[PDB]
Design a protein around this ligand. Structure first.
Ligand SMILES: CCCCCCCCCCC[C@@H](O)CC(=O)O[C@H]1[C@H](O)[C@@H](CO)O[C@H](OP(=O)(O)OP(=O)(O)OC[C@H]2O[C@@H](n3ccc(=O)[nH]c3=O)[C@H](O)[C@@H]2O)[C@@H]1NC(C)=O
Ligand SMILES: CCCCCCCCCCC[C@@H](O)CC(=O)O[C@H]1[C@H](O)[C@@H](CO)O[C@H](OP(=O)(O)OP(=O)(O)OC[C@H]2O[C@@H](n3ccc(=O)[nH]c3=O)[C@H](O)[C@@H]2O)[C@@H]1NC(C)=O
Ligand SMILES: CCCCCCCCCCC[C@@H](O)CC(=O)O[C@H]1[C@H](O)[C@@H](CO)O[C@H](OP(=O)(O)OP(=O)(O)OC[C@H]2O[C@@H](n3ccc(=O)[nH]c3=O)[C@H](O)[C@@H]2O)[C@@H]1NC(C)=O
Ligand SMILES: Cc1ccnc(-c2cc(C(=O)N3CCOC[C@H]3Cc3ccccc3)n[nH]2)c1
Ligand SMILES: Cc1ccnc(-c2cc(C(=O)N3CCOC[C@H]3Cc3ccccc3)n[nH]2)c1
Ligand SMILES: Cc1ccnc(-c2cc(C(=O)N3CCOC[C@H]3Cc3ccccc3)n[nH]2)c1
Lengths: 263, 263, 263
């Protein structure tokens, strides 16, 4: 149903069955399929395509020429009714593409809240983007990629399938990420390698001096101690007993499937 | 003429003279010029611009915000009535651009069949794309580039004008190709350099063990023997007398104008 | 007001207050906001969004899926009524984005005349593009970037915020520019470094043999003499006393805020 307080431009095509929330705005020449849900206050500026089984939260801003919910580019996909979930207060800029999941990959592409997806960012099938992330222009995720909370990916950068971009990471522009990036790390290059802790980001986000020091010491265990990852894992868990922020490493290690980026 | 079994959305603008085949589908807000031919079963999803002297085959899927047949970006082009040809069963994704040829370059941009052109791939004037190719997101061909059968070009990769991407090549993502890539080769980097034979691709495509061995031996002649290309050409032709797959090298050498990528 | 000789397609939406000049053409499914001025003879092909306080000159060609005047991507921007200015005879290709300024950055994004902005080029808030420039496909300017007269930026290349791309520069494709590029220089790489003087460009643009020699000698002072920039500045000014073309260096040095690209 279309809420009586939603605006649907006369040139937009909203198919029967679409759910449009209160005070939403569907601009001219938008197309909205019958399995789409658009939350309260969300705006589709103009020339937006939203289709598939796709749920969009509240107060989103989706700019012209974006394609949300579309058939993914995985040759394995065969038209199965997979899904997209998008949270609240995202800014989804011109030409962004967010594609539906695959059965093989779990059936769901998910984006959280308060993200900024810049022009022509690409969220492939089965990706999971967290909250407060930034993808700069042309940032490109292959299928099954995770971008964890607060992570930032610079312009022109691409991420290989299944990689994890950890929480509070900063990936430089013009980079190619082929392995997993631990939380709190700065990464850059082709292929991307680690350049220490994202100290300034943690500072601005309220991390204490003690937490940042512990995170720097965990970084040193991984990349400067010379031990194997299997040796350092319990040392990082031990450190997390005192500084809970360090637990992000433990949680990341359990999800990592491609190994860590390294010098 | 518009076939009686084609669907033309009421908001689409199909100019008189366009030819639309049986069971084709022209979605909302598409524009189709008077010299366009769209084959049987081809679908333009929505918001597609097709113009120029442009022939499109059957069972193609062309997604929103694509521009097919448009004026090319060569400053030498002056509006002459050049052409685009596109074959059958292509998947041409959001924002792909395929531009018309130039008189200077032969007048024709051509794409074969069963290709996958991912989001914002660019096929410049006078390019020739074969069959069963893949161009990943943002893959960008300058003018006059050839992409031969089964070749794959990774995300964010660009190819300098006139280069040949040989048959069954795999070019990595985040790469810049400045010279010609022999058939069967893996290439990666900025600028791209060769990394051996695309063994896994040949395996999956039915090449025999003997053919792959001969191709590996031809690769060694080119890049490991230390001889000049002029010395190895007759040695490769000799090898092709027994293994016909090796003839692809000979045919490629005759077309190559920029020299081969090298370490 | 809409000039009586302008064409406005029946499907276009031109908001009351927009100014459309003589013999302009607003194609199907374009949107033009109430504070837009479109000059005499300018063409919006189709599916173009123009909004904000945006002035566009005469004889421009703006292709489908372009977004001109749109809200910028700077998180600091809060909706203030900033501006875009675009000159004459520009070719602005599919999916180009040109964004409005920020109060913090001066309030104005400006593009001159006779530029070629290829597919998906991005002109961020507060950028200044001069005359006769070329941005190739996917060339991406962060905020506050200057691209001076005749400069060319190759495909897939991105420029870090506040950088200056000097007059008659040629930046290669697949490059990342993190510092300022002096006039007349060839730059390439990630990050971009200098590769001598753009001799061929100067030749084609009518520079005398004496002027090019002096420019080459100024280049040598900067990058080959081994002196500091502070030592060479007066030596370059001295050279400019005889060869006025060398003054471009002096003017550039006074604007440069990020240091020069270097080997
Ligand atoms: C420096 C880092 C640069 C990163 C650049 C990233 C750019 C990403 C652009 C967005 C793409 C995204 O929307 C879709 C996506 O990632 O899909 C794939 C899907 O996430 C994956 C897992 O589920 O599976 C697929 O990728 P794979 O590479 O695993 O597929 P495949 O094994 O079927 O191989 C695809 C083609 O490559 C050929 N091949 C494969 C291996 C080889 O060694 N040589 C070779 O030629 C093979 O013949 C086949 O034609 C999927 N692809 C295809 C084309 O189906
Ligand atoms: C690591 C690899 C990265 C590759 C990145 C590729 C990105 C491709 C994006 C798609 C572009 C495609 O759609 C169109 C295309 O490739 O067109 C050109 C056409 O294929 C070509 C041949 O026919 O001719 C043209 O390229 P050239 O470089 O050969 O043209 P030109 O000789 O006229 O030079 C163009 C400008 O460069 C200036 N120049 C040239 C040489 C030099 O040394 N310095 C210089 O400034 C010169 O003044 C002029 O303003 C054409 N261009 C132009 C702008 O007209
Ligand atoms: C090899 C070169 C590659 C270059 C690639 C260029 C790609 C450009 C794509 C076009 C973007 C353009 O349209 C907009 C633009 O450039 O805006 C910014 C604006 O020009 C700038 C100045 O006025 O200010 C902003 O950039 P900054 O990086 O200066 O912003 P910030 O200081 O607010 O930091 C942004 C985020 O980065 C986080 N951060 C910052 C520093 C750090 O060390 N770690 C970190 O995580 C920080 O927490 C915050 O969430 C603006 N950004 C944002 C996101 O607001
Ligand atoms: C020397 C250097 C090396 C590598 N990358 C860069 C680089 C990336 C960007 C970029 O994409 N953006 C987005 C627009 O907001 C401005 C900026 C924020 C950002 C900075 C760093 C990483 C990720 C995002 N700008 N410069 C610079
Ligand atoms: C370590 C490494 C180095 C260089 N490039 C990559 C790279 C490229 C891609 C990519 O574009 N795609 C398209 C989407 O299908 C998945 C994948 C298929 C492909 C793989 C390799 C080359 C070309 C295509 N993914 N990773 C990885
Ligand atoms: C070996 C090499 C190294 C780095 N970059 C390249 C490179 C860039 C381009 C490119 O973007 N274009 C735009 C389309 O017009 C053709 C060409 C003009 C141009 C040339 C050089 C710099 C900037 C523009 N082509 N090759 C080549």
């Amino acid at each position: 149903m279309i809420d009586k307080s939603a605006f649907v431009h006369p040139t937009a095509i909203v198919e029967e069955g679409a759910s449009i929330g209160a005070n939403a705005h569907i601009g001219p020449f938008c197309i909205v399929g019958p399995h789409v849900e658009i939350g309260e206050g969300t705006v589709l500026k103009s020339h937006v395509v939203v289709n598939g089984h796709t749920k969009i939260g509240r107060d989103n801003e989706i700019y012209q020429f974006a394609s949300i919910g579309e058939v993914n580019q995985d040759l394995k996909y065969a038209g199965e009714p997979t899904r997209v979930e998008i949270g609240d207060r995202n800014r989804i800029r011109e030409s962004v593409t967010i594609h539906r999941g695959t059965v093989q990959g779990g059936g769901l592409t998910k984006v959280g809240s308060d993200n900024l997806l810049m022009i022509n960012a690409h969220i492939a099938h089965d990706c999971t983007v967290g909250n407060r992330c930034i993808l700069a222009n042309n940032a490109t995720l292959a299928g099954h990629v995770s971008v964890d909370d607060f992570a930032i990916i610079g312009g022109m950068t691409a991420v290989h399938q299944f990689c994890i971009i950890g929480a509070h990471v900063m990936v430089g522009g013009c980079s190619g990420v082929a392995q997993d990036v631990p939380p709190y790390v700065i990464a850059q290059g082709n292929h991307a390698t680690p350049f220490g802790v994202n100290i300034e980001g943690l500072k601005r986000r309220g991390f204490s001096r003690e937490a940042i020091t512990a995170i720097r010491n965990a970084y040193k265990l991984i990349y400067r101690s010379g031990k194997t990852l299997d040796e350092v894992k319990p040392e990082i868990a031990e450190l997390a007993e005192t500084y809970p922020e360090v637990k992000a490493f433990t949680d990341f290690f359990a999800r990592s499937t491609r190994g860590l980026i390294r010098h």
